[PDB]
Subunit: 85 residues, 9 copies
């Protein structure tokens, strides 16, 4: 394996992590949707589906998982730059 | 768009043969395994490039803005946790607007406060690090 | 178009909406039909602005706002800590109800210590953040 | 445009209300109509003030206050610790009720040790903070 | 004493206006915000002084005597736990003195031993620093 | 490979915590003769000496390669499972107890999905990268 | 009676002075001895844990002496072993450190 | 003689005191084993245990540890495959495999945890092999 | 071979280290030695014991400690290995439907994660051995 093989693996990993991040971002909006519905007393959404219970801590934990993906991306990009100097 | 879709399926576990047949049925034309391998190899070259520090800063900036959006959500949730706590204290099972008072523990409020404060901390750390690379 | 328009393209990109979804959602707020290509170009302009080196003066402003936000929470937690002690002492003297008619809620010594710790950490974090602002000069 | 007014603008901004919500929430309180632009200006001036370089002397004052606050908590925890022992000792010799009629509440040994450790950690953290304010010179 | 009570209420979470109102009613005169802020400012000035290392040895010292007292409590509890474990091992639900057998896990006993040992370790370390 | 399999079987059972006498009595079946406690102790002493040998660089390269092969496999297994978790999450979100193929909808929490995503990202970014960097360094 | 009550958090209504190296050496010695005493207690408990695990393996709810078989998990036994081995390790570290700094 | 001494050492290291050891071995083979015989055996054991390892001894330990971990890895790999098998059956409705054995449900997190444990054995193996060159011989 | 003077010393020290007051130690041991032992004697005994325990180890003592610790760990490791095998046996029995082993004993459920955890405890004992052996060759030779 060359240095270009390992940089490609990292680049591909970071691109895959962006896919996961996007899935989690969609889940986070579902979590808010359910929370805000539970707040204003609905037991059922407009679409007929049930208002699922969501704890504030779960929402903050999801936000953190999403923010950590950015951080890990930033750290990986910095570390590949560090091999020069 | 075709180059992006090939990459995406490769990254979700599809091998180049499977990508060739799957994408042959999305568009009209028959694409080959070798054409998929060529498209992936070109994306590998792009993805293997050394990043620029300017691009890294743009990622920090975007990440920090994303964190601010979440932080604003959590700040609203925090107010609603206090509303429910201050109601739960007064013995109410029900708010003035009729919605139920949800149970909230002291630890949960402290934990949410900590989550919001950590977002400020991470923002300051990331900003200082962008300067520290000088 | 506007300052608010570019802000909303960024927000929706950062919430995970793909370009075409951002386009349609913004077409409703203005006269024209916003396209994918107009969205990608506003996003790329936003990335350009976000690549700027920070100002340490601006960083100190973020520290100040963060520490002030922490003082607000700290004041909330301090009141909650007193409520926790009120519950604990009512529990100690055998009461199911407070003098104001409200229910006594069960509180463990570990919960009270944890809350005290959370409050003390906020001071610690303030001191650390203030010191880090001076440390970066040297 | 008072200090009580300006502090309230900053507080609501830090609690997650946007400038227009802040404008309206201040408008309906006083016989007055406050704008967004005015709220934005107050916040901008608060950022300028908050961008000041800190003072190590002020930081020592924060360390002093933090240690005093920690003493207050340590005193509360010491009292709780004595209650825990009282209940453990009563629970040890069979009782469900103290001399004065108050109930014997269940205390585990691990809880007593954990509380002792919390109290001792406040002593230790006192010293570490005192050493750091000198060591930063 | 008035400066201490102002500081104390501030540190318990009262804002300067709440301190002013509540203390006005206690001392029977208009105590104003300006006065409370001024009294807090003075209390900060005293607290902003550099610590002496002769004082830091007094704090390093009194920590260790308090820790000794806790250690002695924990040691007595540790004996109670073993007494309970050895009874519960050999079938009993009641001790020689009529007091009940209370359940104890092996892990609980080990954790308590570890707490007691940690106090000795912390004492040694802090005695070495009390010379340093 | 009759003496080598006997040697390996003795070591394996020693490494799984069997008494030398239990090893002797067990392996007497495999080799159709009365193996003694003294023999297995001698076999273990000889195995100890062999295991004190240093690995060659080629030994290590092969070990790294076998480990890289395992990591790729695990990464693909978890990707399929992750997608099945999303399928279940989405079905659940729209009120279905049953999938289009007649199989039941199993409950899945947002945290479970995030955790699985992290498992996969750690394989990509830590496990595989470290093994690749070891291959490079070894030549 | 006087100082003990102050340090336990009651209000009224030298200990700042340095110890000798001799005293610190004595403190180290006593700590290590106390640890040996605890170690011996845990070793006996470890044996009773295995006896219970072994009876639990053979379906017994009662040992030969009539006493009840108490449920023990493999993780609990491993953890207890770990506690006992840690006391040894902490002894070795403290002994080395005493030669470094208290000779 | 050799089995006898090993058993004295074992019981000592298990927290049995010399008097108790002497008594328990006096019954194991019927003769009055003294405390002073036990203490002589244990003093001789301490001497042997005091001996430093050679570098060769350490390499052998590294080698045996690698092999032990490999044996565990293969057990874990077999358990992983089985957990997969049961995930994919529980997925498509089933409560019984083709061979009659029951389907036992498995959580995704548990499958991922097992993968991670197997890969952890791998990084420990590679680290130990590399440290065999960089640290030993 | 009598050793009752040292037994008295050890027991005074032991009870002190378990948190008994000198006066209680005196009252308690008066039974053992059939003699009226005073607080003051117990205090002198503790003071003498403090002096003795303040003696430094030799390097030879530390070598011996290391060696005993590693042997003790070998013993626990062997217990854990036997427990590991039972766990596997039970897991495999459960996998193929059995409620009872060939020896008549009941199949008791086990989680894969707990088998993994036990293997790791056993593997850690090896690495801790290697670490301690290396350290002894470094600093005690």
């Amino acid at each position: 394996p060359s240095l270009e093989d390992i940089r490609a693996e990292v680049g591909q990993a970071l691109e895959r992590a962006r896919i996961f991040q996007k899935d989690l971002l969609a889940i986070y909006q579902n979590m808010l949707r359910n929370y805000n519905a539970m707040m204003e007393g609905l037991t059922e959404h407009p679409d007929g589906t049930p208002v699922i219970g969501v704890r504030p801590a779960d929402i903050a934990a999801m936000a953190d998982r999403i923010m950590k993906i950015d951080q890990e991306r930033i750290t990986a990009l910095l570390n590949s730059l560090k091999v020069l100097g």
